[PDB]
Amino acid sequence: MSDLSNQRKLASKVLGCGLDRVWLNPEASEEIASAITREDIRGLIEEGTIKAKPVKGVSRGRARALAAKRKYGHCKGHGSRKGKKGARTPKKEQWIKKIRALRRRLKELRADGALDKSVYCRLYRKAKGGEYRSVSHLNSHLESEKLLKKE
Amino acid sequence: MSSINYPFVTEKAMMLLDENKLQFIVDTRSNKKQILEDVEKMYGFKVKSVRTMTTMKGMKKAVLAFEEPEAAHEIATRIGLM
């Protein structure tokens, strides 16, 4: 065989792959060397003489096992943390989720008749003032102070 | 002043005859309207469209699509290409 380089370049264009993805049959070299046109390369491709080798991806299974453990709360301790507290949990997002949960809880309590407008206004301002850690804390304050219009 | 110099007869230019197109070397000073009128007066076939390009030899090549089927073959036979 002389250079099969023209055929390899044409076959990578026809197959839509990279140049080294192209596999030329080391036994059918003279058959490949007679292929000049895109039609000849297409014939060799259809008859299996020229093919595109499989892409060797990056397997992600062991990342899957690690991700499952991290979902469970493991493999995530202080010796694994590298970013600042704030790059791992931004503070504005924490506040946003907290205040939105508290406000939605208060809105539903006022809607379903458990909370009149006078105490709803004060509770809303208290939530805006960081008086409650979460929805559970707010509910506990409601039940301890008996602010819910129980019936 | 004819804008048409002669048919371009290369492998790619001869591949046009099987799609009823014909490629000419034309005067580079002329445009598509002049090329169309010159070809229609030169061979008496209606031209559907003109495609033109300038080359690195300083020439202008025009590809002419014809309306009547077989017109490219008839002109190529009249010239002597086929």
């Binding site: - | 580079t28 300038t54 080359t55 690195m56 030899k57 300083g58």
Partner: protein
């Protein structure tokens, strides 16, 4: 992909077709007295003063 006008590309085309060897028959006709000309060049050298 610099953008040339018609005349700039025409001058480039003339420069390109000037960069050809003297014909062999000219060398035969002149008895090896004309074997080259001053417009020979290479594209990767001191550029054209044309465009």
């Amino acid at each position: 992909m610099s953008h040339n006008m018609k005349g700039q590309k025409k001058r480039l085309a003339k420069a390109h077709k000037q960069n050809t060897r003297v014909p062999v028959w000219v060398i035969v006709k002149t008895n090896r007295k004309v074997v080259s000309h001053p417009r020979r060049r290479h594209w990767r050298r001191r550029s054209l003063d044309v465009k």
